[PDB]
Symmetry: C2
Subunit: 351 residues, 2 copies
């Protein structure tokens, strides 16, 4: 049976032509058009997703499948669900379903799925990158280059080797594990805190030492890497008090969630030098307003939120999306880990 | 017997007080003043090292030991040697003796030594950092932050994971080996070329595969890392021809020597997009003039030449220098590998 598939992505414009493997955009559309069309489906792709008059709303009433990414998400409200006669399947080409009303989706008997696990190497790499950028003081050196300067002292005074430094990951899920694996050869003192100890083999392999008490671990760290989710416990947890307990000059890397930091506490402690540097790609609010204080605070090595939308991640998101589409057409279950809602049943972690 | 020791270093000014372990400056002076003075030696430290009327020249006539770093080197000419009644020992607190007339030193019966091997981890780390910076496209992301922008597409289209990429090191001495060790966990296809194969053990451990023919290796690489000395053979070796044979979009990391690249060939190939990115801390000429085109060329991730003057490298330079001073005072030989000239005998590598 022919299905109407709608993909919502941002327009990449010239970037899409500069890189045809930039799949997460309108122009390249996950690389699935030829295949979908060959199978007799209709594939409608648009960036125009807000407003009653937008292209998306033209298709909401009769689409079967709506695909988007967290980067230009088509918001799936109860209101839009109610208008969607044929909608069965919501796919995130990526990870993140925060733009979907999951309860409404479940109530409507929908399936909601995402490409679980497909960003983890990307984020772990980006963390390691940021550890080195901060530790070795890349940013001031880069900024001298562009300004026509040459002032070694101005860079050297805050530049260290990573070797021998104490690096603590707060959380050691999949991303923190991959990070520790990549840190092992640098010859650091690796500490981790998590709800779960890694297997003793993995700890010997990475050399990471479990620290049950987080308030014991943090003051020992030259570098702290945030690798847990935003919960009531972790929200604003890096506040004035907690940042105060960290080593003076601590370097913090945060590709987890911006709101784990209390935003102004981080600015104050960066202006006072207590935080030596802060680098991440996650912000609050996100996208970060032009005025976001983390943009202009001293020693920042921020970027916009791109670590999980490398081309390689995008390829995995596209492949996962195609796999689930094929399964959907064939009446085959998706990988269990991909389901957020399955035929109207919200997975227990999302209840 | 009491000796007059002269150290020549740049003034770090406020940077020296901000970081008292910034040893490679006038203000902190290798951290050896108290020790030297306790031993009854005189320690004169100055940054004023050029011209007939400079502080250094006041002391050249009767100093026994002259210490400097490559960052603000006291040039040891035959002329100055001839004027130096008591000079016996030239130490570099660091690596690099290009500011010393070695043949004149040898003719004068001098000893010239440096702190061999003390920068290797620092440079290897910095290379690995730059691999990630380029591969993951940090710089354009950082630049958007500062400019108040938020354009994921503009960053994503040239951002990749390091995982899976073919990384070739041109040369695999100590620094290339350390780099390969650090690259292992990233899950890359590691290639190396060098005059010497690593032991099969170390190849198995790093997963790096030896490529005898450099012209076979280079076109396969997503990333090329320069890890050879500047010789008649390697000088300008990355010219238009060779750059042309590299994969379009190749990323090049160069903390070896600037002149291994033909300077304008790199600019042309970066402007054409054939080189996707170029990052290093070495330049020709060095210091890089305000006008240096590598500063302003697209996709550059340069810094001034600081990778080997991290605080940790400086501590090793200072410690090596102190060790040699103590040996000198006690009439003990230095580590063999530290000698460039030993009591007038130039090491055969330097003839």
């Amino acid at each position: 049976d022919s299905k109407k598939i709608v993909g919502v992505f941002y327009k990449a414009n010239e970037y899409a032509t500069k890189n045809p493997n930039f799949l997460g955009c309108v122009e390249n559309a996950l690389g699935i058009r030829d295949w979908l069309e060959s199978q007799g489906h209709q594939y409608i792709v648009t960036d125009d997703k807000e407003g009653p008059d937008c292209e998306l709303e033209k298709h909401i009433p009769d689409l079967h499948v709506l695909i988007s990414t967290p980067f230009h998400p088509a918001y799936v409200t109860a209101e839009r669900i109610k208008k969607a006669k044929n909608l069965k399947l919501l796919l995130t080409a990526g990870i993140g379903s925060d733009h979907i009303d999951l309860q409404a989706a479940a109530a409507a008997g929908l399936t909601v799925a995402e490409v679980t696990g497909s960003n983890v190497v990307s984020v772990a790499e980006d963390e390691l990158m940021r550890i080195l950028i901060l530790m070795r003081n890349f940013v001031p050196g880069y900024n001298q280059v562009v300004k026509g300067e040459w002032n070694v002292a101005g860079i050297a005074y805050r530049a260290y080797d990573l070797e021998g430094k104490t690096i603590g990951t707060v959380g050691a899920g999949r991303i923190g594990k991959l990070l520790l694996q990549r840190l092992k050869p640098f010859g650091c003192n690796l500490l981790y805190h998590d709800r779960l100890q890694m297997a003793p083999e993995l700890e010997k392999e990475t050399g990471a030492k479990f620290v049950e008490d987080l308030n014991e671990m943090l003051p020992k760290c030259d570098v702290i890497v945030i690798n847990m989710p935003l919960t009531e416990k972790t929200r604003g947890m890096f506040n004035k008090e907690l940042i105060g307990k960290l080593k003076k000059g601590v370097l913090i890397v945060n590709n987890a969630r911006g709101a784990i930091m209390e935003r102004q506490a981080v600015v104050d402690a960066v202006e006072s030098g207590h935080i030596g540097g802060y680098s991440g790609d996650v912000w609050d609010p996100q996208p970060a307003p032009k005025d976001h204080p983390w943009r202009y605070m001293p020693n920042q090595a921020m970027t916009p939120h791109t670590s999980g939308t490398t081309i390689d991640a995008q390829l995995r998101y596209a492949a996962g999306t195609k796999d689930m589409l094929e399964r959907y057409f064939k009446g085959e279950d998706f990988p269990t880990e991909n389901y957020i809602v399955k035929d109207g049943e919200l997975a227990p972690q999302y209840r």
